[PDB]
């Protein structure tokens with residue numbers, strides 16, 4: 575019974591078996607109750623503020639060849655770009671002028687910047703009195719250390735899949751063990767650290783999803799980014815099935831139940847597969863939103879997956895749009911940098 579599973583989640587009985595059954599039950603009434611539980615937990619622990627992280631995707635150059643990603647090195651049907659350090663800093667300034675209190679710098683694994691150009695950019699943005707989050711991939715400890723000394727606050731490095739076999743197959747340059755080592759290094763260096771995974775990868779099972787949830791709970795991540803897999807036509811996975819929105823939403827809800835004081839975005843991928851999908855996600859456990867702040871003409875060239883919603887609008891439209899979203903949801907914008915506010919419990 576769904577009722578029994580809900581009771582067990584409510585009492586914090588987070589066994590493998592409970593999680594598996596929650597993900598396996600397809601009943602509408604159960605799912606809606608699960609979503610309501612996560613929404614309530616979100617409200618009680620992290621409140622009504624929705625934190626805005628403005629993302630600048632500053633280079634689509636990548637040395638890796640992940641099978642799912644549109645930026646993989648083997649994709650020749652992509653115009654590659656690099657923003658200059660001045661462009662990046664001034665674009666960050668504009669986001670701060672528009673009210674962003676975190677700047678996220680994301681790129682492919684592009685050697686050109688690493689480490690010192692990033693450090694210089696980070697230092698310049700930090701003068702603006704905002705949080706800086708980096709999402710640059712896997713690099714040596716030394717690079718992560720340099721970026722932390724330069725002032726970076728947070729680092730996003732999704733674990734992608736906690737199944738090491740599937741991880742190696744989908745990310746043939748690397749391994750789950752290296753991904754985890756990177757995440758542990760970032761935690762040690764004092765970053766607020768984000769992990770997370772895709773849902774509906776080819777070959778991924780429900781037990782794999784359970785393992786993702788248990789992995790997240792084990793390491794107590796500050797942020798967890800979850801979205802559906804969306805096949806990209808210029809990759810080896812072009813003909814595979816999209817991830818299911820409802821199942822992905824259940825993963826967000828369960829993440830909030832498991833990690834009640836974490837920061838959890840309503841990802842752009844959720845809003846790509848279903849119209850209004852970010853808004854739904856913000857009502858099922860999420861409390862962060864990441865408006866795209868990549869300028870034209872580059873924005874349209876950073877498509878990890880196709881259909882990305884933000885590609886066609888004026889490049890200053892996203893921050894105002896998310897502020898409207900937050901209001902029509904009956905929520906409030908974040909007042910501070912939206913760092914993790916731990917609630918210690920039992």
Ligand SMILES: C[C@H](CCC(=O)NCCC[N+](C)(C)CCCS(=O)(=O)[O-])[C@H]1CC[C@H]2[C@@H]3[C@H](O)C[C@@H]4C[C@H](O)CC[C@]4(C)[C@H]3C[C@H](O)[C@]12C
Nearest residue numbers: 605606607608609610611612613614854855856857858859
């Ligand atoms: C807006 C729609 C449709 C509601 C509706 O239209 N239902 C009939 C009329 C009800 N009214 C009270 C408006 C009038 C009753 C008098 S009447 O004469 O119309 O029957 C309702 C139906 C199911 C609801 C979702 C689920 O819960 C799961 C989840 C819980 C979270 O916490 C918040 C998010 C989420 C996704 C919910 C959002 C929203 O809330 C939904 C879509």
Ligand SMILES: C[C@H](CCC(=O)NCCC[N+](C)(C)CCCS(=O)(=O)[O-])[C@H]1CC[C@H]2[C@@H]3[C@H](O)C[C@@H]4C[C@H](O)CC[C@]4(C)[C@H]3C[C@H](O)[C@]12C
Nearest residue numbers: 667668669670671672673674675890893894895897898907
């Ligand atoms: C960038 C330009 C020119 C002036 C400028 O460079 N302004 C820097 C402001 C810096 N901050 C945001 C940190 C101020 C916070 C003050 S606050 O009192 O909100 O704490 C200013 C002039 C008018 C400002 C918009 C409007 O206002 C409406 C709206 C208010 C929301 O709220 C934030 C979003 C939005 C769209 C604003 C964005 C931006 O800002 C605008 C475009």
Ligand SMILES: Nc1ncnc2c1ncn2[C@@H]1O[C@H](CSC[C@H](N)C(=O)O)[C@@H](O)[C@H]1O
Nearest residue numbers: 642643732801802803804841842843878879
């Ligand atoms: N085809 C793919 N489908 C779905 N996701 C993919 C894909 N390709 C890489 N991603 C994901 O995007 C993450 C970067 S942040 C994405 C952002 N929040 C957004 O939703 O746009 C990577 O770590 C992957 O999990």
Ligand code: MET
Nearest residue numbers: 681682683709710711731
């Ligand atoms: C653009 S994909 C996300 C950033 C980084 N390349 C990573 O795979 O973690």
Ligand SMILES: [Cl-]
Nearest residue numbers: 627676707728
């Ligand atoms: Cl962040």
Ligand SMILES: [Cl-]
Nearest residue numbers: 799800839841
């Ligand atoms: Cl994310």
